[PDB]
Amino acid sequence: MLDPNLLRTEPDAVAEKLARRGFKLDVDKLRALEERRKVLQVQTENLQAERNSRSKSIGQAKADIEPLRLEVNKLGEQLDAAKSELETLLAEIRDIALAIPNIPHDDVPVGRDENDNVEVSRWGTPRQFDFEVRDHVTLGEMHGGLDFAAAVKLTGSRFVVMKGQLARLHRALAQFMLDLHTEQHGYSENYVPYLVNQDTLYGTGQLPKFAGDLFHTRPLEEEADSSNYALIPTAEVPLTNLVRDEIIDEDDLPIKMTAHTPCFRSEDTRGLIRMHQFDKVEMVQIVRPEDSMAALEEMTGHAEKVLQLLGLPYRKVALCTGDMGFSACKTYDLEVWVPAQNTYREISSCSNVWDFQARRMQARCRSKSDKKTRLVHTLNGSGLAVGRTLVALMENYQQADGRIEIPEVLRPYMRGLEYIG
Amino acid sequence: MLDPNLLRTEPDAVAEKLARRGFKLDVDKLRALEERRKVLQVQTENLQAERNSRSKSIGQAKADIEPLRLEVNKLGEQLDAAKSELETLLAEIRDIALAIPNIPHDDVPVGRDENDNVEVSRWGTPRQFDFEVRDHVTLGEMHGGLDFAAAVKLTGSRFVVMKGQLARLHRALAQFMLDLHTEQHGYSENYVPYLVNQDTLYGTGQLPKFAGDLFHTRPLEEEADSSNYALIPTAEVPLTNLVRDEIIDEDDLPIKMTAHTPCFRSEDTRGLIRMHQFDKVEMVQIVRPEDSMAALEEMTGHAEKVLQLLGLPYRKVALCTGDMGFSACKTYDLEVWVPAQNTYREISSCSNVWDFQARRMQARCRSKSDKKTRLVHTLNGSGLAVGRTLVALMENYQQADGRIEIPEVLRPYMRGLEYIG
Ligand SMILES: Nc1cc(CO)cc2ncn([C@@H]3O[C@H](COS(=O)(=O)NC(=O)[C@@H](N)CO)[C@@H](O)[C@H]3O)c12
Ligand SMILES: Nc1cc(CO)cc2ncn([C@@H]3O[C@H](COS(=O)(=O)NC(=O)[C@@H](N)CO)[C@@H](O)[C@H]3O)c12
Ligand SMILES: [Ca+2]
Ligand SMILES: [Ca+2]
Ligand SMILES: [Ca+2]
Ligand SMILES: [Ca+2]
Ligand SMILES: [Ca+2]
Ligand SMILES: [Ca+2]
């Protein structure tokens, strides 16, 4: 959600920044709705006041209360009708306001799509192979460890069954990532629900605009009016909502949280690349408004550190205005080298959300003296998407016979094992 | 599913065994449906034969084919009508057959409910405390590590948010359990889908009878006719279905599999005890029919070994006929000591399923020479339910000030940490 006072004072200036994302803000409709809202708001508050006054006259006349009671009931019917008409108009304003993406920060390069993204840095040298590179699907078949056919039998397309040592390696990657962020990077570990409610989804921006990208669960028989849930598309959703409706003491900031969860989306026909269910170790930071740009560089470095310790070459890319996600104001993507595809592929997206989710959640901070609160800033970043790390690990460390060399940093997580196979 | 030939030859003998569970088999309705099925089956196969013959006469007359074509279309309409009437009757037989629980093995003590279960063994001595025992909810509040209120905000009742060292300890328990079963007990690790289809749910017995105990997801826009999924209530569902429609070489048996998954059910108002989402390390065995009773003792010992290495006192209980789950033919429950409740509480259920799920899945085995296949037997057991292990660990190892002593066997999983707090 953008600042409603910013939409009322500078609508054309806001529409200009949003045009860089390719978003056309309907300024004309927002103005006509807002002018009609002020007319209905005055009419409604006048009815609220006269009804309140007419009912006080009843208690004052108790010292015939029937002619006064009829008037109070007509005023009550008129007030409810005016309140419903007003609420219908407020919901139309909300339908527009809650579908507006975040305003891009000035640091973001202007661009129309992913071909306009700017490479910021590169690390490591892609391996030169002495044989024909096999992809992760072929490697998983050779080991009997990645089985897409069994997952189609159990469920359907875009799911996987991992078996044996490759399932073990996938678990080891998550253990290493969680240990790195909690032991070296200052994040606190969290176990979160994988089903969340509508308030949580509105809070992080998935609702109202991206309902179709979620798996929704039908309400339960015994919780019929309070169980309209959806599976989490990322741990960013439950983690960021932990500060919803909170006033945090600024001394307690930053709040740095991590979690390893499955992620569920219904948004590459072959492999672990774009599945409906995938594991991801997520990093979330809740910070003071002035520290969010520095916290973005810090969190991006925490994700880069995972790729560096694993020996996986990668590139850091600043997303342009046209390639950013809905709630981000600034994003860096990390793209890992994938030898069978001869290119870098996205493995992490690190964003500064500014106060866009804090506005929806009412997440604020305050100094003990300060007579006023302030919205916090929120940030989220993959550190990393675990299945994509397994793809990169398998392809970059494959041997001529298909054996997988286990990166040195993961060997304590595999009981010192050097190779799978 | 029970053997259909056993329901046709010994219906009263089957009804007698099922009566021990408190299940009344409607023998009279099954017989009347089966007699009417034989009438419709003869009438249908006679129509299939005459239609097949009448269409062959068309090709033979190509050497006027209009009087013969009209007859073929009337026969075709009569055959389709007879096939639909027959299929409606087959579905009524299926509605009865697929709701019948498994026949209890003779080893199972006869009983009406859980108060008739038989204690088989006991291990360890419940700790005598020098202070008033705190429950896991109070301990989690003192540490700030178990937060039920935050989970109600994110989702609703019967969910939890774990934070900091207690989330870390919960992860350490799962790591230890998976490492024990894969390193010492011969199980192969699996990563499975957490959403499964209707065939999978019918295969393990959740459908048709227990649909109301599952979270169901609405079909996806782009997969409208192939995405009616449900969240897994246990890893037994995807793991056991890995052998659906397979003929396994008997030399490859036993197939021993383990997985750590969240579990989702909508079946203790306070705590981690009965939540809609809980983690569990599951053990599944697919074995030859003659080895299933020995494999049950082996798998129960693998679950008991977890409690023993963790130093948690427990009791092993043989469930009576009236307290067994739907698909089990024989079950042992392990009940861990819970000091705040002054009793043992269920933490594992280990079952021999016999051929009941193998019948539904068509999972069979064969020796290379053997001219005929045989249904395998399946088994499943908790090793263990992770949140209940955390409950027992917290309460049994709490110190007077609320600190949690980390069991010796988990300390390598916590970087040598001795106490939380
Ligand atoms: N996003 C993606 C989509 C799909 C479609 O179901 C399959 C994937 N399997 C792996 N990912 C990986 O998930 C990462 C994070 O996703 S993101 O939407 O860009 N960003 C977030 O969710 C933020 N909370 C920061 O992590 C991406 O960088 C991608 O590599 C997939
Ligand atoms: N079952 C249970 C139900 C609920 C209600 O949502 C919450 C729970 N939180 C922990 N469990 C634990 O899950 C264990 C296994 O569940 S079972 O249905 O008995 N058996 C199976 O699922 C087999 N596949 C063997 O594991 C039980 O022993 C119980 O301690 C819960
Ligand atoms: Ca501080
Ligand atoms: Ca974001
Ligand atoms: Ca992106
Ligand atoms: Ca063998
Ligand atoms: Ca069972
Ligand atoms: Ca039970």
Author numbering:
A (entry chain A), B (entry chain A): 1 to 63, 67 to 270, 277 to 430
Structure paper excerpt:
The aminoacyl-tRNA synthetases (aaRSs) are essential enzymes playing a central role in the translation of the genetic code and hence constitute a viable target for the development of antibiotics. Based on the structure of the catalytic site, two distinct classes of tRNA synthetases can be discerned. Both classes activate an amino acid in forming the respective aminoacyl-adenylate (aa-AMP) as natural reaction intermediates. In view of their resemblance and irrespective of the class, aminoacyl-sulfamoyl adenosine (aaSA) derivatives are well-known high-affinity aaRS inhibitors, but they lack antibacterial activity due to their low uptake potential. Structural analysis showed the flipped 2-hydroxymethyl-1,3-dideazaadenine base is partially mimicking the interactions of adenine within both series of aaRS enzymes.
For class II aaRSs, the adenine makes numerous interactions with active site residues, with the N1, N3 and N6 all making H-bond interactions with conserved features shared amongst all class II aaRS members. The interaction between the N3 of adenine with the conserved water molecule for class II aaRS enzymes is crucial for the recognition of aaSAs by the corresponding enzymes. It was hypothesized that the flipped exocyclic amine moiety of HMDDA should be able to mimic this specific interaction. However, in the case of SerRS, the base moiety adopts the syn-conformation relative to the ribose defined by the torsion angle (O4′-C1′-N7-C8) of −124°, while the base bound in the active site of class I LeuRS and TyrRS and class II AspRS remains in the anti-conformation. In this specific syn conformation in SerRS, the hydroxymethyl group of the base forms a direct H-bond with the carbonyl oxygen of Met284, and N9 makes an indirect contact with the backbone nitrogen of Met284 via a water bridge. Despite the HMDDA base making some interactions with surrounding protein residues, compared with the adenine congener, the lack of H-bonds mediated by N6 and N3 of adenine with the conserved Glu270 and structural water molecule leads to a detrimental effect on its inhibitory activity. However, in class II aaRSs, two different base conformations were observed, where the base adopts an anti-conformation in AspRS as seen in class I aaRSs but a syn conformation in SerRS. This is likely the result of the distinct flexibility of their motif-2 loop regions. A comparison of ligand-free and ligand-bound states shows that the motif-2 loop is in a relative fixed position (a closed conformation) in SerRS independently of inhibitors binding, while this loop region in AspRS is more dynamic, which has been described in detail in our previous work. While these values reflect high affinity for the target enzymes, the inhibition is 5 to 420-fold lower compared to that with the original aaSA analogue.
